[PDB]
Every structure is written in structure tokens, then in C-alpha cells.
């Protein structure tokens, strides 16, 4: 993995495969997740999922 | 122009790296003309 996606995954606390986190959607977070898209799956969770 | 930090530290105040090549050229020309004048003086003596 290149160092910038590695750093973004570290700052998102996604250090192991099948780790999941909650993110509040701002532009400053959306661009980060857009960069690490070759490693993650994300979406909009409902109340049952939460 | 990339410049060495040590060379810029040793550089005199007010002078620039943009005149270094002209400095070396002036030095070489001065040495050559000194040799030429010595040859002229010896030939005049002969």
C-alpha cells in the first residue's frame, strides 16, 4: 500500500481487515474516504445496523 | 541555480553566485596575459 492511503487508513483507525468505523460526513472526511476507496467499502447505515 | 550552503556561507557579502564564472574567467585571462607579457619582454631583450 502506498504511504498516503496507509496514512489515511491509520487516521480512520482502519488497521486490520474487516475493521469498521463511523464517520460524520463533511468534505474533510469525504475526500479522505474517496482516496482510500481501493481498500474500503462504505455506505449510509440505518438504525438497525447502528 | 542550486547553491551549496557551505559555499554561500563562505561567500563574501554582497557578491552573488551569478558572477562566479566571470570571476574564474577573469582570473584565467589575467594569468594568460601575464605569461604573454613575460614572453614579449624576453623576446624584446633578445
Amino acid at each position: 500500500i502506498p504511504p498516503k492511503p496507509r496514512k489515511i487508513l491509520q487516521l480512520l483507525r482502519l488497521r486490520q481487515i474487516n475493521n469498521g468505523v463511523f464517520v460524520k460526513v463533511t468534505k474533510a472526511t469525504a475526500e479522505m474516504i474517496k482516496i482510500v476507496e481501493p481498500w474500503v467499502a462504505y455506505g449510509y447505515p440505518n438504525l438497525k445496523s447502528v | 541555480i542550486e547553491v551549496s550552503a557551505a559555499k554561500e556561507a563562505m561567500r563574501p557579502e554582497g557578491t552573488s553566485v551569478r558572477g562566479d564564472k566571470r570571476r574564474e574567467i577573469r582570473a584565467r585571462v589575467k594569468k594568460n596575459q601575464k605569461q604573454m607579457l613575460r614572453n614579449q619582454r624576453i623576446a624584446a631583450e633578445k
Partner: protein, 150 residues
């Protein structure tokens, strides 16, 4: 696998004396109890200095103590976790109450002749178990031949 760019760091300070002195072991037990069961920061600093090596406990002289006994400190109990030495350049020793790890013979004699008191650290623990009204003093750490050569 887990990507851990940062590394967990093991402790880089002494947790126990390297010395095999039995009385120092008893002192360490006592101040472990005091620094666990009190809130006073004095006891924790004293315990840490009881752990330390000799280059980390430089001697404190009587002239250094007399310098720090000025300006409202004349009644505070002086606490040193190293050796207290005598300074023969200091002709007049003031009255002082000093608790130290050990004293030289001349330093103890001159303090008692000036009318002060010398204490061990366990007597200090008995009389001031929270370090109230004390002056904690260290000697010059970098005043060593090797440290000059660094």
C-alpha cells in the same frame, strides 16, 4: 494482520534499585507504601530518587544547603537523596534540619555543632510523611569529568 505504524514503548526509567543494599531495600518498601497510599508528590519524587544510580545522585554540600536556606527557607526541613558533604570554604554553618541518604563525618559533626539536626530518610518519613515544609535539593548533575568530556 494489523498495520501498526507506531510502536508500543517499554518503560525507559528505573522501577527498582540495582543496588543490593538491604537497608535501601527496606527504604524502597517504605516509600513504595507512602507513594501508593498518599497524595503527596514529594513521596513519589523521593521514591524515584531512591531508585537512582550514583551519577544520578551527585553530592550536595553544606554551602549549597546554606545558599538554599536563605529567603524564608530557614525553618524548612532540607531533604537530599544523596550524600551531604562538608565545605571547608564555608566557615560559619547555619542552624539547619537536614534529612539525607548519608552524611560525611565532618558534615554531620559541623551540622550538630552549629545546632541543627541530621535525619535519615525513614525518620523523615516518620516526621513528615507528606513532605510538608521541606526543601528538596539536588546536587550538580553535570559537574562530572565524563560529562565535561561529552
Amino acid at each position: 494482520g494489523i498495520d501498526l505504524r507506531w510502536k508500543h514503548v517499554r518503560s525507559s526509567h528505573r522501577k527498582a534499585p540495582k543496588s543490593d543494599n538491604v537497608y535501601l531495600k527496606l527504604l524502597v518498601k517504605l516509600y513504595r507504601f507512602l507513594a501508593r497510599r498518599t497524595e503527596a508528590p514529594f513521596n513519589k519524587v523521593v521514591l524515584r530518587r531512591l531508585f537512582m544510580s550514583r551519577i544520578n545522585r551527585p553530592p550536595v554540600s553544606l554551602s549549597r544547603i546554606a545558599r538554599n536556606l536563605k529567603n524564608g527557607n530557614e525553618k524548612k526541613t532540607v531533604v537530599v537523596v544523596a550524600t551531604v558533604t562538608d565545605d571547608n570554604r564555608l566557615l560559619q554553618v547555619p542552624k539547619m534540619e537536614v534529612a539525607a541518604l548519608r552524611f560525611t563525618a565532618k558534615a554531620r559533626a559541623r551540622i550538630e555543632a552549629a545546632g541543627g539536626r541530621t535525619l535519615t530518610l525513614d525518620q523523615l518519613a516518620l516526621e513528615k510523611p507528606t513532605g510538608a515544609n521541606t526543601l528538596l535539593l539536588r546536587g550538580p548533575k553535570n559537574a562530572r569529568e565524563a560529562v565535561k568530556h561529552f
